[PDB]
Design a protein around this ligand. Structure first.
Ligand SMILES: *[C@@H]1O[C@H](CO)[C@@H](O[C@@H]2O[C@H](CO)[C@@H](O[C@@H]3O[C@H](CO[C@H]4O[C@H](CO[C@H]5O[C@H](CO)[C@@H](O)[C@H](O)[C@@H]5O)[C@@H](O)[C@H](O[C@H]5O[C@H](CO)[C@@H](O)[C@H](O)[C@@H]5O)[C@@H]4O)[C@@H](O)[C@H](O[C@H]4O[C@H](CO)[C@@H](O)[C@H](O)[C@@H]4O[C@H]4O[C@H](CO)[C@@H](O)[C@H](O)[C@@H]4O[C@H]4O[C@H](CO)[C@@H](O)[C@H](O)[C@@H]4O)[C@@H]3O)[C@H](O)[C@H]2NC(C)=O)[C@H](O)[C@H]1NC(C)=O
Ligand SMILES: *[C@@H]1O[C@H](CO)[C@@H](O[C@@H]2O[C@H](CO)[C@@H](O[C@@H]3O[C@H](CO[C@H]4O[C@H](CO[C@H]5O[C@H](CO)[C@@H](O)[C@H](O)[C@@H]5O)[C@@H](O)[C@H](O[C@H]5O[C@H](CO)[C@@H](O)[C@H](O)[C@@H]5O)[C@@H]4O)[C@@H](O)[C@H](O[C@H]4O[C@H](CO)[C@@H](O)[C@H](O)[C@@H]4O[C@H]4O[C@H](CO)[C@@H](O)[C@H](O)[C@@H]4O[C@H]4O[C@H](CO)[C@@H](O)[C@H](O)[C@@H]4O)[C@@H]3O)[C@H](O)[C@H]2NC(C)=O)[C@H](O)[C@H]1NC(C)=O
Ligand SMILES: *[C@@H]1O[C@H](CO)[C@@H](O[C@@H]2O[C@H](CO)[C@@H](O)[C@H](O)[C@H]2NC(C)=O)[C@H](O)[C@H]1NC(C)=O
Lengths: 49, 59, 204
């Protein structure tokens, strides 16, 4: 901590053993890839399967 | 959409029965439906065999 | 799933066939013409598919699911199966209900029972055949008995078929050993048609 007794300063912590974390996107998606030309293509979010 | 079954109509006992369906007008890749078989013994009721789909999840 | 064995109606009348054992809403009914492939007439209970008349409607009350056909016609004569999802991903089918829209008139079945022959016993084989005919509707269950107690083994029963007089007919084949044939005197064959049963018995 920059200033410990000071509650206005954040306290940075460093771990010994790494912690396993899993973050997933339980939505199987599709890309529309709509055409907003000329030459440009936007990727829209389709339906979730 | 048409389903055409094909394979041996006559098989000997204790052997391996193999049958193959040929789809027309639709894709097996499509995630809207499952694909499988349903067998109906002669003069009897409908029995479910099984179905599968490659459209998976994260695990 | 338990589906009633038979169902009958005149043209224009409305028939309601039931199904039980469905705790979920995944219930679906099918129509199979004899000598053809089954076709789905309803899904997700009441909802109808493409090219299916309004007169087919699904319904589920409690544990009982029901199909209702109003304004009967010739093309409605077939076997109707029900099915639903169960447990995790398994699916089952009922025995199916045979609904007939045949021409008039209703009539009690007719049973003729033939004991094994003398030449047949020489092959060390014994077979009794129940001949049931001239009944409406076209769905009948057959049962076998020996003296008193019923016979659960060697029973082969086949789906009935229409005749030239438009009356349905079926035959059940019982194949057993000659030892149990001579030991048990009489063999009874019970034929159940719309609640009422018709019985025949033979002894050597
Ligand atoms: C990192 O973070 C940490 C914490 O997270 C930060 O730490 C903070 O640091 C600041 C400093 O900037 C501290 O504030 C100063 O506190 C001191 C000390 O105060 C304590 O002690 C006093 C005396 O204690 C002794 O006497 C008693 C009696 O006998 C005895 O019982 C005791 O045991 C001990 O022996 C107490 O008076 C004082 O209490 C008062 O203050 C409390 C805090 O506000 C309050 O709660 C109490 O109720 C009571 O009111 C406390 O216990 C103070 O002395 C100092 O005051 C100076 O600064 C303020 C501005 O904040 C200013 O207004 C004052 O006038 C004073 O300035 C005088 O001193 C200067 C230096 O000598 C001088 O240059 C000035 O000119 C001025 O002197 C003038 O006046 C006097 C008479 O008044 C005269 O004689 C002179 O000649 C001249 O004319 C501050 O308040 C914080 O306390 C501390 N935090 C905590 C939690 O403690 C740190 O800053 C951070 N750093 C970084 C880099 O991030
Ligand atoms: C999330 O949802 C999505 C859907 O939105 C799911 O994605 C589906 O996943 C399944 C499963 O992987 C895929 O099936 C695979 O297909 C490939 C071929 O893919 C190409 O062709 C497809 C069909 O195209 C035809 O039909 C369409 C539609 O009618 C038509 O338009 C087209 O013109 C053509 O006529 C295309 O759909 C497909 O496009 C996809 O990919 C594009 C990028 O490439 C993308 O842009 C598209 O949008 C679309 O997503 C593509 O063009 C098969 O090759 C593959 O088979 C192998 O892989 C599976 C596992 O994936 C495995 O089980 C099989 O056994 C097989 O593995 C063997 O063969 C490999 C070579 O073929 C070999 O490398 C392997 O090692 C293995 O070989 C070993 O084992 C075998 C025995 O198994 C042995 O014989 C060998 O000797 C050797 O030992 C799949 O079947 C779908 O295509 C895909 N998409 C869709 C839309 O369904 C996804 O699964 C869901 N879940 C997750 C987590 O994402
Ligand atoms: C999000 O809403 C759109 C309509 O704005 C849906 O797209 C329609 O889907 C139905 C299927 O029930 C089709 O009959 C229509 O032709 C579609 N209309 C258009 C303009 O695409 C879409 O299905 C909804 N989200 C999804 C894909 O579930």
């Amino acid at each position: 901590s920059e200033n410990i007794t000071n509650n206005a300063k954040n306290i940075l912590v460093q771990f010994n053993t790494p912690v396993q974390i899993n973050c997933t996107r339980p939505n199987n998606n599709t890309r529309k890839s709509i055409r907003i030309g000329p030459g440009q293509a936007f990727y829209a979010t389709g339906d979730i399967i | 959409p048409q389903l055409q079954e094909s394979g041996p109509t006559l098989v000997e006992a204790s052997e391996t029965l193999s049958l193959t369906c040929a789809v027309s007008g639709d894709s097996t890749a499509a995630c809207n439906s499952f694909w499988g078989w349903v067998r109906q013994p002669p003069g009897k009721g409908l029995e479910w065999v099984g179905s599968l789909s490659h459209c998976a999840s994260y695990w | 799933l338990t589906q009633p064995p038979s169902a009958s109606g005149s043209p224009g009348q409305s028939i309601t066939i039931s199904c039980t054992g469905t705790s979920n809403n995944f219930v679906s009914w099918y129509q199979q013409h004899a000598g053809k492939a089954p076709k789905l007439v309803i899904y997700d209970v009441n909802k109808r598919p493409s090219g299916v008349p309004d007169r087919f409607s699904g319904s589920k009350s409690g544990n009982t699911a029901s199909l209702t056909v109003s304004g009967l016609q010739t093309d409605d004569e077939a076997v109707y199966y029900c099915g639903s999802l169960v447990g995790n991903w398994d699916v089952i089918f009922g025995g199916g209900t045979k609904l007939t829209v045949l021409g008039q008139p209703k009539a009690a079945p007719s049973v003729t029972l033939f004991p094994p022959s003398s030449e047949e016993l020489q092959a060390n084989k014994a077979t009794l055949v129940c001949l049931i005919s001239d009944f409406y509707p076209g769905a009948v269950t057959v049962a076998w008995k020996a003296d008193s107690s019923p016979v659960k083994a060697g029973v082969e029963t086949t789906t009935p078929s229409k005749q030239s007089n438009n009356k349905y007919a079926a035959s059940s084949y019982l194949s057993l050993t000659p030892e149990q044939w001579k030991s048990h005197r009489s063999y009874s064959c019970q034929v159940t048609h719309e609640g009422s049963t018709v019985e025949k018995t033979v002894a050597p």
